[PDB]
Amino acid sequence: TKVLLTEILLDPMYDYAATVARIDGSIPMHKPRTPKEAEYEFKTVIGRTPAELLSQKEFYDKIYTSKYRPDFTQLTRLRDEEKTSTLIYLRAYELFLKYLQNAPNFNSELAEFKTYENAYGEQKALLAQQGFYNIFDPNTGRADQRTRLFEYKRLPISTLYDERGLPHKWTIYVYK
């Protein structure tokens, strides 16, 4: 019993099922303080007593299943946004539980819910924008292109050599 409890209590699956059970009140919101509360939480979440888990053979067949069965067919895009978030969470739990149980007709529903969650993630990323600004060039109507970069230009040869072909030596300072 101790080894079984230590193994399952450290399974993230158990914690996720326990959270789902806590949401609708099947188990107390506080973690167990006494062994009786732990046994009750195990019975509610896993669905089988630890003594009877060792006697039979399945494990995933009777894990908690949320009480409220909302309609996930409104996840077809169709007080609406928080309800959509609740539907996303509940369908994620239901699909994860189906994945554990190797339920038939699973990959197509997984892809459909992945598309739904991608749309929900687009909305959430819309909620997560600090903003953006572009310093517009007043002469134009868009991002500034003016720069102080170097621009090549073929200067006249008179700047380097005088009328007698000798190079210039600018070495006399004229002060006014």
Partner 1 sequence: LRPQITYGPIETVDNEELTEADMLSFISAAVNSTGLIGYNIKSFDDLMDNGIPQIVKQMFNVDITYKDQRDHTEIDKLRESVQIQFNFTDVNIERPQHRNYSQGNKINLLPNKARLCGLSYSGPVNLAAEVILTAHYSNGRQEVKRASIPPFQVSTFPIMRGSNRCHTHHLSKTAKKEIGEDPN
Partner 2 sequence: MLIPVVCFTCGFPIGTYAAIFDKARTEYIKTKMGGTLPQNIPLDASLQIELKDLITALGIPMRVCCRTHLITTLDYRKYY
Burial 130-154 (b: 16+ CB within 10 A, else e): eeeeeeeeeeeeeeeeeeeeeeeee
| Strand, helix or coil for residue 167 | strand
CA distance 140 to 73: 49
The letter for the amino acid at 4 is L
Instruction: Tell me which of partner 1, partner 2, none is bound by residue 131, counting a contact when its beta carbon lies within the kind-specific cut-off of 5 to 8 angstroms.
Output: partner 2
φ and ψ at 84, to 5 degrees? -65, -40
Window contacting partner 1 (CB under 8 A); options: 36-44, 55-63, 74-82, 164-172? 55-63
Q: Which of 57, 79, 142, 154 binds partner 2 (CB under 8 A)?
A: 142
Instruction: Decide: is 92 part of the binding site for partner 1 (CB under 8 A).
Output: yes
Contact partner at residue 110 from partner 1, partner 2, none, CB < 5 to 8 Å by partner kind: partner 1
Q: Which of 29, 78, 128, 174 binds partner 2 (CB under 8 A)?
A: 128
Least CB distance from residue 91 to partner 2, whole Å? 19
* Nearest residue (CB) to partner 1, 130 versus 147: 147
Using CB distances below 5 to 8 A depending on partner kind, what does residue 59 bind out of partner 1, partner 2, none? partner 1
Residue 132: which of partner 1, partner 2, none does it interact with, CB under 5 to 8 A by kind? partner 2
| Per-residue CA distances from 114 to 19, 52, 108, 110 (Å) | 22, 37, 10, 6
Distance CA 58, CA 81 (A): 38
Check binding of 9 to partner 1 (CB under 8 A). Answer: no
User: Contact region for partner 1 (CB under 8 A) — 6-14, 27-35, 66-74, 166-174?
Assistant: 6-14
Q: For partner 1, what does the binding mask look like between residues 13 and 52, x meaning CB under 8 A?
A: x-xx--x---------------------------------
How far apart, in Å, are the Cα atoms of 28 and each of 24, 25, 34, 107, 166?
A: 10, 6, 13, 34, 98
